[PDB]
Scaffold this active site. Structure first.
Site, PDB file in Angstrom:
ATOM      1  N   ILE A   8      13.823   1.203   9.608  1.00 53.22           N
ATOM      2  CA  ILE A   8      11.851   1.418  10.020  1.00 53.22           C
ATOM      3  C   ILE A   8      11.702   0.748  10.347  1.00 53.22           C
ATOM      4  CG2 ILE A   8      10.051   3.177   9.181  1.00 53.22           C
ATOM      5  CD1 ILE A   8      11.637   4.351   7.704  1.00 53.22           C
ATOM      6  N   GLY A  11       7.976  -4.317   6.093  1.00 51.01           N
ATOM      7  CA  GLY A  11       6.174  -3.748   5.735  1.00 51.01           C
ATOM      8  C   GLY A  11       5.600  -5.223   4.747  1.00 51.01           C
ATOM      9  N   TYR A  13       5.505  -5.637   2.353  1.00 52.65           N
ATOM     10  CA  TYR A  13       6.590  -6.487   0.973  1.00 52.65           C
ATOM     11  C   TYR A  13       7.689  -6.484   1.063  1.00 52.65           C
ATOM     12  CZ  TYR A  13       1.497  -5.440  -0.703  1.00 52.65           C
ATOM     13  OH  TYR A  13       0.242  -5.843  -0.884  1.00 52.65           O
ATOM     14  N   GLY A  14       8.009  -5.850   1.746  1.00 56.13           N
ATOM     15  CA  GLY A  14       9.850  -6.103   2.202  1.00 56.13           C
ATOM     16  C   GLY A  14      10.075  -4.973   3.093  1.00 56.13           C
ATOM     17  N   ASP A 118      -5.730  -2.625   1.907  1.00 58.24           N
ATOM     18  CA  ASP A 118      -4.583  -2.783   3.922  1.00 58.24           C
ATOM     19  C   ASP A 118      -4.446  -2.042   4.721  1.00 58.24           C
ATOM     20  OD1 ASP A 118      -4.257  -4.556   4.958  1.00 58.24           O
ATOM     21  OD2 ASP A 118      -2.361  -4.980   4.261  1.00 58.24           O
ATOM     22  N   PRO A 121      -3.084   0.468  11.437  1.00 58.19           N
ATOM     23  CA  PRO A 121      -2.145   1.790  12.364  1.00 58.19           C
ATOM     24  C   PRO A 121      -0.694   2.410  11.750  1.00 58.19           C
ATOM     25  CG  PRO A 121      -3.260   0.919  13.796  1.00 58.19           C
ATOM     26  CD  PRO A 121      -3.929  -0.342  12.822  1.00 58.19           C
ATOM     27  N   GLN A 122      -0.445   0.908  11.415  1.00 61.08           N
ATOM     28  CA  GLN A 122       0.563   0.812  11.509  1.00 61.08           C
ATOM     29  C   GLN A 122       1.819   1.794   9.819  1.00 61.08           C
ATOM     30  OE1 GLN A 122      -0.726  -1.756  12.159  1.00 61.08           O
ATOM     31  NE2 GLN A 122      -0.188  -3.489  12.422  1.00 61.08           N
TER      32      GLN A 122
HETATM   33  C1  LIG Z   1       7.831   3.109   3.539  1.00 59.21           C
HETATM   34  C2  LIG Z   1       7.550   4.892   3.619  1.00 59.21           C
HETATM   35  C3  LIG Z   1       5.582   4.531   2.995  1.00 59.21           C
HETATM   36  C4  LIG Z   1       7.393   5.302   5.006  1.00 59.21           C
HETATM   37  C5  LIG Z   1       8.240   6.951   5.303  1.00 59.21           C
HETATM   38  N1  LIG Z   1       7.858   6.309   6.045  1.00 59.21           N
HETATM   39  N2  LIG Z   1       7.766   5.938   7.355  1.00 59.21           N
HETATM   40  C6  LIG Z   1       7.537   5.280   8.292  1.00 59.21           C
HETATM   41  N3  LIG Z   1       8.452   6.811   9.127  1.00 59.21           N
HETATM   42  C7  LIG Z   1       7.319   6.170  11.119  1.00 59.21           C
HETATM   43  C8  LIG Z   1       8.867   5.631  11.533  1.00 59.21           C
HETATM   44  C9  LIG Z   1       8.934   4.324  12.188  1.00 59.21           C
HETATM   45  C10 LIG Z   1      10.075   3.817  12.628  1.00 59.21           C
HETATM   46  C11 LIG Z   1      10.914   4.913  12.582  1.00 59.21           C
HETATM   47  C12 LIG Z   1      10.744   5.706  12.252  1.00 59.21           C
HETATM   48  C13 LIG Z   1       9.742   6.355  11.315  1.00 59.21           C
HETATM   49  C14 LIG Z   1       7.269   4.214   8.391  1.00 59.21           C
HETATM   50  C15 LIG Z   1       7.406   3.313   7.578  1.00 59.21           C
HETATM   51  N4  LIG Z   1       6.678   2.218   8.279  1.00 59.21           N
HETATM   52  C16 LIG Z   1       6.884   1.256   6.862  1.00 59.21           C
HETATM   53  C17 LIG Z   1       6.723  -0.672   7.738  1.00 59.21           C
HETATM   54  O1  LIG Z   1       6.933  -0.973   9.070  1.00 59.21           O
HETATM   55  C18 LIG Z   1       5.446   0.269   7.067  1.00 59.21           C
HETATM   56  O2  LIG Z   1       4.871  -0.566   6.227  1.00 59.21           O
HETATM   57  C19 LIG Z   1       4.624   1.810   6.481  1.00 59.21           C
HETATM   58  O3  LIG Z   1       5.405   1.787   5.354  1.00 59.21           O
HETATM   59  N5  LIG Z   1       7.199   3.389   6.302  1.00 59.21           N
HETATM   60  C20 LIG Z   1       7.649   4.659   6.072  1.00 59.21           C
END
Ligand SMILES: CC(C)c1cnn2c(NCc3ccccc3)cc(N[C@@H](CO)[C@H](O)CO)nc12
Length: 289
Positions: A8, A11, A13-14, A118, A121-122
């Site tokens: 995905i 992040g 943290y990891g 924090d 948009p991410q």
């Molecule tokens: C882990 C959970 C919250 C979680 C649940 N969904 N998700 C998505 N979904 C959107 C997506 C993007 C690409 C491919 C498929 C789906 C991105 C993401 N992004 C992480 C890393 O970019 C960010 O740290 C926010 O958690 N964390 C999460």
């Protein structure tokens, strides 16, 4: 217990993976971060902090000196959606619905005295039902927010409140209002409001738009740890210049979310009551999956 289906992203943290629960078919997002038991106790309490606009934390697994967080999976994030809307922008009713839903998420977490710290948009994730959700709520308190990610990517400063940039140690719920305000402005204009590339560049970008702060608009500011008398003294600009063509209600709310004084900055609860939300609805986004 899980097979990875795809990466995905990375992040703070990891790494985060889309995964299927190898026995139950359940599709989830697995975030992989030995850990201090303070960070375990804190994270575990988040499993109870449930709300329709907070990405649900399904499980916390501490094993093999590693920590896995199992979350519900959403198919898109707000950063990708904005880039995908670059050429025509996000329509206003959808901006309004997303702002309204995020403020409901904040009002909920704030009411339990949990801040995010924090927002960006991410970490605002969206589904096909017109919902938007806060991810990473509570993880900053648990691990701090560092300067770079585990892959050494820069942690963005663009949404950081000025009290944090000014070296304040005890920040309040108002830091999440500031970030959300910045994100609101970026959805409307299609450009980041304050894209700083260092702490002083982020501060000076703030001061160039909102005026260098002083004891008149922010009592105590000159006493903050990283405040310097020698800061250049810029005049404030009009919001009419900053987020055209936002309407007077939306400009007023924005202005309240971006008050320098965190005691005067509007609360999420008060913001839900603002006239800007008089005609708020819940449209569906067009998403290509
Ligand atoms: C882990 C959970 C919250 C979680 C649940 N969904 N998700 C998505 N979904 C959107 C997506 C993007 C690409 C491919 C498929 C789906 C991105 C993401 N992004 C992480 C890393 O970019 C960010 O740290 C926010 O958690 N964390 C999460």
């Amino acid at each position: 217990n899980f097979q990875k289906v795809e990466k995905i992203g990375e992040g703070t943290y990891g790494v985060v993976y889309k995964a299927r629960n190898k026995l139950t078919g359940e599709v989830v997002a697995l975030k992989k971060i030995g850990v201090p038991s303070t960070a375990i106790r804190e994270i575990s309490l988040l499993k109870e902090l449930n709300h329709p606009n907070i990405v649900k934390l399904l499980d916390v697994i501490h094993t093999e000196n590693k920590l896995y967080l199992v979350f519900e999976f959403l198919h898109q994030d707000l950063k990708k959606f904005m880039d995908a809307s670059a050429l025509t922008g996000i329509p206003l009713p959808l901006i309004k619905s997303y702002l309204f839903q995020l403020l409901q998420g904040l009002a909920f977490c704030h009411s339990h005295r949990v801040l995010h710290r924090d927002l960006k948009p991410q970490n605002l994730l969206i589904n096909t039902e017109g919902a938007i959700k806060l991810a990473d709520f509570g993880l900053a308190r648990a691990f701090g927010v560092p300067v770079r990610t585990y892959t050494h990517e820069v942690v963005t400063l663009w949404y950081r409140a000025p009290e944090i940039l000014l070296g304040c140690k005890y920040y309040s719920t108002a830091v999440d209002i500031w970030s959300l305000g910045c994100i609101f402005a970026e959805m409307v204009t299609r450009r980041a409001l304050f894209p700083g590339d260092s702490e002083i560049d982020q501060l000076f970008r703030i001061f160039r738009t909102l005026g260098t702060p002083d004891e008149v608009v922010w009592p105590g500011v000159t006493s903050m740890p990283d405040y310097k008398p020698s800061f250049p003294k810029w005049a404030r600009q009009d919001f009419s210049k900053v987020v055209p063509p936002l309407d007077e209600d939306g400009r007023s709310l924005l202005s309240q979310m971006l008050h320098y004084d965190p005691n005067k900055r509007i609360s999420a609860k008060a913001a839900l009551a603002h006239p800007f939300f008089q005609d708020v609805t819940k449209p569906v986004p067009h998403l290509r999956l």
